[PDB]
Design a protein around this nucleic acid. Structure first.
Lengths: 73, 68, 191, 150, 52, 121
RNA sequence: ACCACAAAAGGUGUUAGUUCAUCUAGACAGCCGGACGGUGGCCAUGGAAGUCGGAAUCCGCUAAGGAGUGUGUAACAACUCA
């Protein structure tokens, strides 16, 4: 908030700086993401995370998400 | 020889100060300040003279030296 | 924010009597009398008793509350000047040319005469205001003492005696010479 | 008889006494060799509280807890040649750093042996003081021998 | 020969000050504000350089 | 964590009131760390010295009117740079330790509190 | 209003507002006193004790005191700051 401020000068216009929500490279608000971490829908790929879907075929959804359905806390 | 700070004898706005209404439909009647709202509006009622209870700006009214 | 009233309380000791009409202030005490014109500031003085006076600003802004506070400070300086009095001890600074300071009478005006400041040939002169006396220090080298009632007269005379010895066209942090105010005390010895 | 008190310092065997002890009626060259009989174990840098009674050099040894932690370490060096730092890490002494540190005049305002044994046992920045760990993170786990010294 | 009992009060009145950048005036060390209306009361400052 | 430290202060002041019965309010003014260190070392047996913020003590006493209200008579005597000494020895030995020891050229005892009353000692 | 101009950046000039933290559980500011001990820690040893220079960045008493914020100094003393 004092580093984008320091770059704010080297642009034209009068643009502002707001603090992001939602783990702000992805979508999906910070408490909703902390609830989806506990379910297991959230699969780490490099630098961005693929999300689970309920409309795909079931076989590859199980073999790509082994931890969602189970008795893991 | 003492502290000869003299008077500056005012009449003040306060709860209980009796006023004379000079502008409006009340037109020259005694009322009493009931509860003071802010620096400019007060709440008055003068019920034995006939003016209804109302908020008023302190421009329309003029203070009397009497109190109760 | 338009405060509805602000007040300050001035404490009055025993041996002084104050007389405030409209905004003219007269303070009488064991060292004499002082007067001050405060008609330009819109404050109200109110006696609560012989020892305490409240000043007040009713429906005032921010500047006006600051002006109330400085009215308190000025009346306090008048009271402490008429009880104790003020006494500034100034101390000379010279490296090579000894500053020579005399008290002369010129047409009844009692000037202070400064000679040989950094070897200057200009004979510098400073007038002495009304109510300030000037003594020289016993058994302390290079010290003048200005003592009087008000802080304004004493301090402005000390500042006139200071600023008449500025250094032009040279380095001020190398040429350090001048007459500087050293100590700001009271005339009474205990305080 | 008079009182002269000085605080001499680090020296290898006989390693500027003259400027501090000229007014106390003592020697200059003989006083440098008089401190060799105390700091000669004790070859680590410490202090010496000397007390001259106006006619002789009578130097004593001040109880130093960091030098006592250095007295349970490696002494290997001779003089002027170790070429990097002349420092050496050494053995733990988990029980020898609790009896000697709690006997160096009981300073620093301690009300326990685990207090002094952590004050002069967790300040180790030249030694590790452990065989499988390090110092300065064992003060919250050293809870033995507290009732023995007190 | 100044005998620094006299020089310390001189540095108190002269040398222990702060310097603004755009207007180049003498300012007190704890002061963070210029009192002028032509420079716009700006806030950037520095300590004044002493001798060497 | 400031609320935690102040709740800790409330908890320990409630603890050290309800365990001791002999109180020595002391007028400790401008005392150095050299004097206080040999007070912390000397009083390891009977008396516990408690310094701290005497204006934090005000609301601490105000909130302790429910249990032991006889500490109500201490708020006029928390005035000044004062500290507390918590012990069970009633009058003599603690006053002889505080006042007489460690003087050089302020360690006095201004108030003595014993189970509800006040004593000049 | 067209329309005969004004900008980036600032201002403790003043007014209102958002958020965080201390928040009356005496806050900041000021004045008064502390600002410990291990510890000249390990060192490069003419001399280095926080302080020409290097790494570790601890513990107890605590109400609180840094293997120290500058100065002074062949080294300290000492003032001062959190």
């Amino acid at each position: 908030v004092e580093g984008l401020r320091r770059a704010r000068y080297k642009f034209p216009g009068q643009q502002k700086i707001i603090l992001s929500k939602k783990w702000g490279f992805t979508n999906l608000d910070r408490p909703e993401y902390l609830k989806k971490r506990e379910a297991g829908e959230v699969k780490d790929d490099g630098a961005f995370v693929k999300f689970l879907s309920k409309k795909g075929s079931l076989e590859n959804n199980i073999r790509e998400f082994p931890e969602y359905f189970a008795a893991q806390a | 020889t003492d502290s000869i700070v003299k008077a500056s004898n005012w009449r003040l706005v306060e709860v209980g100060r009796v006023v004379l209404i000079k502008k409006g439909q009340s037109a020259g009647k005694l009322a009493a300040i009931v509860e003071i709202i802010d620096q400019k509006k007060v709440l008055i009622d003068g019920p034995k003279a006939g003016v209804p209870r109302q908020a008023i700006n302190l421009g329309q009214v003029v203070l009397t030296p009497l109190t109760f | 924010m338009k405060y509805i009233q602000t007040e300050q309380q001035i404490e009055v000791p025993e041996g002084v009597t104050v007389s405030i009409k409209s905004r003219i202030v007269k303070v009488v005490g064991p060292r004499g009398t002082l007067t001050k014109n405060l008609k330009h500031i819109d404050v109200t003085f109110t006696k609560v008793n012989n020892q305490l006076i409240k000043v007040a600003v009713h429906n005032g802004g921010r500047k006006h509350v600051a002006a109330l506070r400085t009215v308190k400070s000025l009346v306090d300086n008048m009271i402490t000047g008429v009880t104790k009095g003020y006494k500034y001890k100034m101390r000379y600074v010279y490296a090579h040319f000894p500053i020579n300071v005399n008290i002369v009478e010129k047409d009844g005006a009692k000037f202070i005469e400064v000679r040989n400041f950094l070897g200057d040939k200009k004979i510098r002169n400073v007038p002495v205001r009304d109510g300030v006396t000037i003594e020289f220090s016993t058994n302390v080298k290079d010290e003048i003492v200005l003592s009087g009632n008000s802080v304004e007269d004493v301090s402005q005379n000390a500042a006139d005696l200071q600023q008449i010895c500025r250094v032009r066209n040279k380095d001020i942090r190398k040429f350090l010479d001048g007459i500087y105010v050293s100590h700001k005390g009271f005339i009474t010895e205990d305080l | 008889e008079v009182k002269y008190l000085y605080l001499r310092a680090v020296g290898g065997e006989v390693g500027l006494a003259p400027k501090i002890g000229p007014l106390g009626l003592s020697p200059k060259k003989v006083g440098e060799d008089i401190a060799k009989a105390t700091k000669e174990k004790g070859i680590k840098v410490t202090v010496q509280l000397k007390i001259q009674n106006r006619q002789a050099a009578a130097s004593v040894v001040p109880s130093a807890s960091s030098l006592v932690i250095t007295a349970l370490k490696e002494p290997p060096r001779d003089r002027k040649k170790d070429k990097n730092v002349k420092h050496s890490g050494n053995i733990q002494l988990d029980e020898i750093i609790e009896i000697a540190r709690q006997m160096r005049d009981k300073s620093f305002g301690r009300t326990l042996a685990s207090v002094t044994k952590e004050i002069l046992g967790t300040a180790q920045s030249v030694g590790c003081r452990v065989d499988f760990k390090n110092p300065h993170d064992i003060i919250e786990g050293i809870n033995a021998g507290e009732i023995e010294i007190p | 020969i100044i005998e620094p009992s006299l020089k310390a009060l001189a540095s108190k009145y002269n040398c222990d000050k702060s310097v603004c950048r755009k207007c180049y005036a003498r300012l007190p060390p704890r002061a963070t504000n210029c009192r002028k209306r032509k420079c716009g009361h700006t806030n950037q400052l520095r300590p004044k350089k002493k001798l060497k | 964590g400031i609320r935690e430290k102040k709740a800790e202060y409330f908890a320990k002041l409630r603890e050290y009131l309800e365990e001791y019965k002999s109180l020595f309010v002391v007028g400790v003014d401008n005392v150095s760390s050299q004097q206080m260190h040999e007070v912390r070392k000397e009083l390891r047996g009977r008396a516990v010295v408690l310094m701290g913020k005497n204006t934090m003590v005000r609301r601490a006493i105000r909130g302790f009117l429910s249990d032991l209200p006889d500490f109500e008579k201490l708020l006029p005597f928390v005035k000044g740079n004062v500290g507390f000494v918590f012990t069970n020895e009633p009058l003599t030995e603690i006053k002889n330790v505080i006042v007489s020891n460690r003087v050089a050229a302020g360690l006095t005892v201004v108030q003595v509190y014993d189970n509800g009353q006040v004593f000049p000692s």
